[PDB]
């Protein structure tokens, strides 16, 4: 499963954060800072795969804001990238032309979508349309 998933900007600002492992607040902040420094100090030809703390630190940002994942060494690396791409596509479909400004303003919506997509670090919605329909129905509740 994914221990922690966080979306951070290129400048270092964090736009998303979702950790499935209970860690101390100071320890969590230190881990996030170390992850940001490693991602911020990595080139574009590093394969987007880092083995930090025995965790598959996979970093793949399609825009100025990047995303990071931390999964155990028990599954293939391509699965994490495919899940990240599917989540990005689902978020773009739910929002529509998602930008950095909309992510900050839509932090609650992004968190709800992430919760409805993956819970506890494991994939919960394999389909792409069923999850979107469920998110729309939940939003329409009020």
């Amino acid at each position: 499963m994914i221990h922690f998933i966080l979306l951070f900007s290129r400048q270092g600002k964090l736009r998303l954060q979702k950790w499935y492992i209970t860690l101390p607040d100071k320890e969590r902040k230190k881990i996030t800072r170390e992850i940001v420094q490693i991602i911020l100090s990595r080139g574009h030809r590093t394969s987007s795969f880092v083995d930090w703390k025995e965790l598959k630190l996979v970093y793949k940002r399609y825009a100025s804001l990047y995303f990071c994942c931390a999964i155990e060494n028990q599954d293939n690396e391509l699965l994490t990238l495919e899940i990240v791409h599917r989540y990005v596509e689902l978020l773009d479909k739910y929002f529509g032309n998602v930008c950095e400004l909309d992510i900050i303003f839509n932090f609650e919506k992004a968190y709800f979508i992430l919760d409805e997509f993956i819970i506890g670090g494991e994939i919960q919605e394999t389909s792409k349309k069923i999850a979107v329909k469920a998110i729309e129905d939940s939003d329409m509740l009020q």
């Binding site: 290129r10 825009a63 596509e89 773009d92 400004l101």
Partner: peptide, 10 residues
């Protein structure tokens, strides 16, 4: 800026 750009450009 670079923030208003689409994450995937689709």
């Amino acid at each position: 800026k670079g923030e208003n750009t689409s994450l995937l450009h689709p």
